[PDB]
């Protein structure tokens, strides 16, 4: 497609809205509020990255490192053992979020620590991403170019590895300087060897703005948990929440429609988001 074809209105067949009139009010407030007040807060995996390509499942960006040749079989077995231990805690309906926090911190820290026992060098991150079949949603060029041209900050949150995310966007030539990645970044020594992780730890239950005049927000996600990503932004006046519903659609549709203003069901593209951005940014 040309970049001019990377735009769609809200009448697209993938679009669901519980309150279409409220959506129009929100969009109107964002437009009249101006580009100078806007920020975009987005999840990465299966939101900006693509779930399927002409119906064929794409690999998850979360699995790029774990599925690559730069970690040993021993390390892969240990990461699987951590998953089998901690995943039941993550999904336990009898524990509060606060109760899950120390265990998620422990899981993420142990998994990062295992990576630090490998012999990973910085240049290998780009290699493993180059060899992966991970893809960005169709229409990413217009999405990233529009936010960059209009000076709109884009905060991309991910509980995965920041270096992997960053490399995907870099290799697609859209790593523009309005992008601010909030994720788990590796720390490399002067010889380029992985020696630790930097900064705030981002796991599934603290992926929000407490980890980072832009009082108007567009939030993009694909999970129910992603609805909290703007928590911690001070003074938000208007927010539009857009959710991609990629799978388990019968189980999830009603809850997604009650919680997100716009749901995009089985939509491999950013076209509806790009159309809203063009309308909002005039
Ligand atoms: Mg996601």
Residue numbers in the entry: -1 to 210, 221 to 290
Authors' own words:
5’-Cytosolic nucleotidase IIIB (cN-IIIB) is one of the most recently discovered 5’-nucleotidases and has several unique structural and functional features. However, one of the most preferred cN-IIIB substrates is m7GMP, for which the activity of dephosphorylation is characterized by one order of magnitude lower KM constant compared to the other preferred substrates, whereas kcat/KM is comparable. The crystal structure of cN-IIIB consists of two distinct domains: the globular core domain (residues 1–51, 132–182, and 215–300) and the smaller CAP domain (52–131 and 183–214). The core domain is a haloacid dehalogenase domain (HAD).
To date, these are the first coordinates obtained for human cytosolic nucleotidase IIIB. The second domain mainly consists of a bundle of helices that are responsible for recognizing the ligand. The C-terminal part of the protein (residues 291–300) and one of a loop connecting domains (residues 211–220) were not defined in the electron density map, and thus are most likely disordered. In all three crystal structures, the magnesium ion was octahedrally coordinated by the carboxyl side chains of catalytic moieties of Asp 41 and Asp 230 and the backbone carbonyl of Asp 43 and by three water molecules. Ligand-binding triggers substantial changes of Tyr60 and Trp105 sidechain conformations to form a system of aromatic rings that stabilize the complex. Crystals appeared in a few days at 4 °C after mixing protein with 0.1 M MES (pH 6.2) and 22–28% PEG 3350.
